[PDB]
Structures are given as structure tokens and as C-alpha cells.
């Protein structure tokens, strides 16, 4: 009996298949989150600066109140 190297292909490994595809981001939907984070960013920040004004006037009031200084 002769024994040589046997042939096997099975699945053929798929000859040239695309793996690159669009994922997560679509296009217009990313701008809704992108610019949406900006509008949420300013509104949250400016409310803190209005709360800073409560401290600001109260800080300068200490100088006016102190005349024996």
C-alpha cells in the first residue's frame, strides 16, 4: 500500500471576504450626540457660574463690612 499526502479543503477558508463594515456610527446620528453634548455642556457650566455669583458678591461684601481693618 502507498501512503502519500492527502488532500483536504473542507470549507475552502472563504476566498476573499470583506471584514470592513460600518459600525456604531452612522453619520447624522453622531452629530445629534456630538452637538447635543455641547448644548448640555454650556447649560450645566453656566448654572455653576450663577452659583459662583452668590459667593462672589458675598466675598466682596466682607471688605465693605470690615472698616476696623
Amino acid at each position: 500500500x502507498x501512503x502519500x499526502x492527502x488532500x483536504x479543503x473542507x470549507x475552502x477558508x472563504x476566498x476573499x471576504x470583506x471584514x470592513x463594515x460600518x459600525x456604531x456610527x452612522x453619520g447624522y446620528s453622531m452629530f445629534a450626540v456630538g452637538i447635543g453634548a455641547l448644548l448640555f455642556g454650556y447649560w450645566s457650566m453656566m448654572k455653576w457660574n450663577r452659583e459662583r455669583r452668590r459667593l462672589q458678591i458675598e466675598d466682596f461684601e466682607a471688605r465693605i463690612a470690615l472698616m476696623p481693618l
Binding site: 461684601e61 466682607a62 463690612a65
Partner: protein
């Protein structure tokens, strides 16, 4: 120059340490009449020798 007397004004000046005075802003509301009259005197007459 003609300076003020060695006895000067106010016996035992200041209460204690700083920040303590800055902690209370109620000093503006209570006792304002002596503070405002000293302020009114000093801006009209710049000399400390007169409004002491």
C-alpha cells in the same frame, strides 16, 4: 509735621486672630453708625489726623 500724641486712640486694639472677623458678615448689619460716619469723614477729609 505735627504728629498725634503717644497715647493715641483705642485701648487694646483688635479682638484676636484674622479670618474670625471675615467669617461673620453680620458686622455690617449690627453697629453701622460708627463705621459709616468714620467712612464719611475720611473721604471728605483725607487726613487721618482729623477724623481719628
Amino acid at each position: 509735621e505735627l504728629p498725634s500724641l503717644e497715647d493715641l486712640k483705642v485701648q487694646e486694639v483688635k479682638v484676636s486672630s484674622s479670618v474670625l472677623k471675615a467669617a461673620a458678615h453680620h458686622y455690617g448689619a449690627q453697629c453701622d453708625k460708627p463705621n459709616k460716619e468714620f467712612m464719611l469723614c475720611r473721604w471728605e477729609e483725607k487726613d487721618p489726623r482729623r477724623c481719628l
